[PDB]
Design a protein around this ligand. Structure first.
Ligand SMILES: CN(C)C(=O)c1cc(-c2n[nH]cc2-c2ccccc2)c[nH]1
Length: 337
C-alpha cells in the first residue's frame, strides 16, 4: 500500500472487486482522504473499468459525483504494478446505512434529490452510469451524497439498444430494468432511472424491492409487483421470443404501492411509480423526476448544473497491455514534472 510520502496514517475502510479503499492523511492539504488501490493489469476487463472510470471522473466535476483528486503510480510503465486513485473521503454508503438505519421521509427525500441531481449531470454528458445501487452511493456525516464507481459507465447509444431475448448482462441483478432481460443492451438513459427507482423503494422499506436470485427470476420479481404488461407495452416489444415469453405467463395483477409501502409518503409513491414503469419510453426522465412534487422543497433547476460538453461517443477492443499505457498516459498529469 505504498502511496509515497504525501499520504500517511492509512486506515482500512472497505474492500471489493474494485480493489480496497483506505483512509489516509494528505500532508499537502492536511485533509484526510480516501485512496483506492487497483491492480487492473491482471485481466483486460478490469483494465477497461479502470480506464472508463478515470477518463469520466477526470472530466466530471459535480457536488454529487465522487472526484479524483490525485492518482499515484510508479514513475515508469515498467515499475507500475498498481494504480492508486485518491478520491473524496466519506463516512459510509447507502448499503451500510440501510442494513441498520431507518430513514425518515426527510432523509429519503434528500437522498433521492441528490441522486437525481448527480444523475442529471451524468446524463447531460451523454453518459450512462449503468450500475447504480446503494453501495455505489456514499454519504458523509451530514448526509451529503456522492455517486461513485463508473466502471460500467458508457456513452448513451439509443440507436443500438436492441438485442435478443435473454442476452447476458453484467450490471448488478437486483437493479436491472425489465427490458435488459427482454430486448435491451442498456444503452439508453432509462436504464439508470429504473435503478434509482429500485433504490427509492429500498429506502422506503430497508429491503431490495426485486431480490432476484438468477437472471430470469429477476424479471419474475418485477412482474410480480407491476403486474402483467399491457397490450400497448407488449406491442412495443417486437422481438418474438421476448414477447412470447411474456405472453406465456399467467396474468398477474399490479400490487398497489401503498400496500407494499403502507407508511410511505404518497407523493414519494407517485414518483416511484413513474420511475418503475415497465415501458422504458414512458419511464420518467431525470429532469422530470427532479421537477416532481415530491422534491419541491429542493427543486431549483438553476442550482442543478449540467456538463459543459458531452462525450463523443472503445476499450472493448484493446489488450490489457495496450491500455496499460492508456492508464499510464491518463494518469500522467499527476506525476511530478
Ligand atoms: C467503488 N467504490 C467503493 C469507490 O469507488 C470508492 C469509495 C470511496 C470512499 N470514500 N469514502 C469512503 C469510501 C468507501 C466506503 C465504503 C467502502 C469502501 C470505500 C472512494 N472510492
Amino acid at each position: 500500500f505504498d502511496v509515497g510520502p504525501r499520504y500517511t496514517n492509512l486506515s482500512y475502510i472497505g474492500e471489493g472487486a474494485y480493489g480496497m479503499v483506505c483512509s489516509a492523511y494528505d500532508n499537502v492539504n492536511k485533509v484526510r482522504v480516501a485512496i483506492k488501490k487497483i491492480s487492473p493489469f491482471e485481466h483486460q476487463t478490469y483494465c477497461q473499468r479502470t480506464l472508463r472510470e478515470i477518463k469520466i471522473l477526470l472530466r466530471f466535476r459535480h457536488e454529487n459525483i465522487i472526484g479524483i483528486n490525485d492518482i499515484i503510480r510508479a514513475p515508469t510503465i515498467e515499475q507500475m504494478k498498481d494504480v492508486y486513485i485518491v478520491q473524496d473521503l466519506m463516512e459510509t454508503d447507502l448499503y451500510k446505512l440501510l442494513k441498520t438505519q431507518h430513514l425518515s421521509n426527510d432523509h429519503i427525500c434528500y437522498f433521492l434529490y441528490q441522486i437525481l441531481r448527480g444523475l442529471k449531470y451524468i446524463h447531460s454528458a451523454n453518459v450512462l452510469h449503468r450500475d447504480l445501487k446503494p453501495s455505489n452511493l456514499l454519504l458523509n456525516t451530514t448526509c451529503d451524497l456522492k455517486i461513485c464507481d463508473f466502471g460500467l459507465a458508457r456513452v448513451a447509444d439509443p440507436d443500438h439498444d436492441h438485442t435478443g431475448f435473454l442476452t447476458e448482462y453484467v450490471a448488478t441483478r437486483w437493479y436491472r430494468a425489465p427490458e435488459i432481460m427482454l430486448n435491451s443492451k442498456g444503452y439508453t438513459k432509462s436504464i439508470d432511472i429504473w435503478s434509482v427507482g429500485c433504490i427509492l423503494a429500498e429506502m422506503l422499506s430497508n429491503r431490495p424491492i426485486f431480490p432476484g436470485k438468477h437472471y430470469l427470476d429477476q424479471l419474475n420479481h418485477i412482474l410480480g409487483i407491476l403486474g402483467s404488461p399491457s397490450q400497448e407495452d407488449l406491442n412495443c416489444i417486437i422481438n418474438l421470443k421476448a414477447r412470447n415469453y411474456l405472453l406465456s405467463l399467467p396474468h398477474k395483477n399490479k400490487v398497489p404501492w401503498n400496500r407494499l409501502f403502507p407508511n410511505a409518503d404518497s407523493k414519494a409513491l407517485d414518483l416511484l411509480d413513474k420511475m418503475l414503469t415497465f415501458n422504458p419510453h414512458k419511464r420518467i426522465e431525470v429532469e422530470q423526476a427532479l421537477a416532481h412534487p415530491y422534491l419541491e422543497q429542493y427543486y431549483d433547476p438553476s442550482d442543478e448544473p449540467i456538463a459543459e460538453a458531452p462525450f463523443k461517443f472503445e476499450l472493448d477492443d484493446l489488450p490489457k497491455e495496450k491500455l496499460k499505457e492508456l492508464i499510464f498516459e491518463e494518469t500522467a498529469r499527476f506525476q511530478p514534472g
